[PDB]
Design a protein around this ligand. Sequence first.
Ligand SMILES: *[C@H](O)[C@H](C[C@@H]1CCNC1=O)NC(=O)[C@H](CC(C)C)NC(=O)OCc1ccccc1
Ligand SMILES: *[C@H](O)[C@H](C[C@@H]1CCNC1=O)NC(=O)[C@H](CC(C)C)NC(=O)OCc1ccccc1
Lengths: 298, 299
Amino acid sequence: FRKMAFPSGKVEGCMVQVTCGTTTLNGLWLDDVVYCPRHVICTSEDMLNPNYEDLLIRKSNHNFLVQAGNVQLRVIGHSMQNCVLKLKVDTANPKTPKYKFVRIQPGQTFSVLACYNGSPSGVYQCAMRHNFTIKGSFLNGSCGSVGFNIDYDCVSFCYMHHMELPTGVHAGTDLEGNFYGPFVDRQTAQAAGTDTTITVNVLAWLYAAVINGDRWFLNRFTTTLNDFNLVAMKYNYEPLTQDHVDILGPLSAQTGIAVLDMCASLKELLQNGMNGRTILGSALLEDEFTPFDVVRQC
Amino acid sequence: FRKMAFPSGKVEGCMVQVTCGTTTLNGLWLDDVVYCPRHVICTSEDMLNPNYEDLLIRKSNHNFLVQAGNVQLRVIGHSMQNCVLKLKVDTANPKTPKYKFVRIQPGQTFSVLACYNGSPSGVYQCAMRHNFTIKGSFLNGSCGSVGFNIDYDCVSFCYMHHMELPTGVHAGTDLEGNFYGPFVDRQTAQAAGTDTTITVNVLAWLYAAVINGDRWFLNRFTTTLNDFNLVAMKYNYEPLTQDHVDILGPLSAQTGIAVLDMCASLKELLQNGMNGRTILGSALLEDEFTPFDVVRQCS
Ligand SMILES: *[C@H](O)[C@H](C[C@@H]1CCNC1=O)NC(=O)[C@H](CC(C)C)NC(=O)OCc1ccccc1
Ligand SMILES: *[C@H](O)[C@H](C[C@@H]1CCNC1=O)NC(=O)[C@H](CC(C)C)NC(=O)OCc1ccccc1
């Protein structure tokens, strides 16, 4: 098993660069709108304590340089929606895929198309952590890079990149400009909350192990969801939601192992350890493969 | 620090489906030629011990069905180069990127665009191992998927996928149809040579760990190149050459940790183990980042 990104071609065709003054970042060009982080309107000194409403008052359409490659797209309108800027341009993107904007939950994974100066650079899989950070790979100029999932050639955009935290993890918004978690786009010291292990994904990994014949950890016990959740929190594991139980449905059917039976196996693992044994070749439980990632890969 | 693949769009526009009889796989469509694994011409019975030249002479252009999305391409010529089939089509691919065919050496990394039925499915980074296998994620129908690197808009194709070994690792050819390693495109269980670890990559990844604030494995000890190589060979690691030491130059200068000081760190790790500790979130020593991969992602 390995982390596998979605093919990025549909998103590459939507990446542009957006510049205000000397501040440059990436934007997402869908139909005749470009979406980008609103701090493009900041000077480096104003990022310390910006008043975005006041800064935007002083901007006009002609203050924004939007380029596809070195080709300028004329801006014909602008507005701010939460922490993103929406720039109306005079050209509809002929490479616009079928798409939706979605807000994801902790645990969900997505592909990141890392971009610099509007040019795609790399693609990799990320998971949204419990503290609403992602363990990304982002350098200066990466803001406006997006995270996405693809379902039958429809691109679901779920993340746009805005900042790095002091711990080295990253924070951003959905495509409506609403940050994930309690962060703000100000260059002020901020701290990620405590992280937890993503229970639903560890369970998916246990099902993946069972599908491949590694099933020593299956025990004879069951549990209720509430009893499991209370024990799991003592090991810094996330409690399960009803949506989590449901998204494990397909893997449960495939293996014939009830979701709550698997929880009982995981609870035994947490309370007793692995005992010098291994699961899918490792003694560490993996928590960045969703149930969909397991089925998609298998 | 993540395993990052190149953006796959330039390759996606080249993937097509190639069907011969009952067998379906992927092809790579560049200009007016489609490249695909030659075992597409086999039936289920041909695969055990196929005489490919004999099987191919009995095929006509119309035995090959090539679908590009929803459009069928017309095959107007076919030839075989080693384990690769070249189908000439009557249409030039307008999305053909600037490209090169390259044969990579062990330790080099590349991105894989996994495809089924001519449709891209996922992208991930692989490395050519010392025994010329790769640790991929490939299922039935993935043959003809390609591996590649991208440098200033030019796609360097280095791998075409052909087979899975019983150990679960994968084998294939360059785009001239020559296998990496001692493998053959016949339906038999084949073993690889001993899998020696690419030492220069493990050292690059340790430098990546330091650049990202991980230092628990560092020590004050030092080692000569030959004394390090004695321990490396004992643990089935490839010997480090002076060229490897030079290639690690930029990472050494950036961290201030001499290459041989990092070698003494790795030697301790090999002899003492990691003792339950982790490096960049990994419990094992990662060997699929080249020095260039580390410098590119880290800067
Ligand atoms: C946008 O390109 C940039 C992304 C940062 C650059 C370093 N790594 C990243 O992920 N975002 C910012 O610079 C952001 C702007 C504020 C208005 C939110 N500030 C920020 O991330 O502060 C932390 C930081 C800044 C510079 C280097 C390292 C961390
Ligand atoms: C091409 O789509 C396919 C890729 C394999 C399918 C399973 N996972 C893959 O990566 N290639 C083959 O099926 C290949 C056919 C040529 C060698 C003619 N055969 C194969 O990989 O089987 C290897 C094997 C044969 C016998 C015992 C154990 C392994």
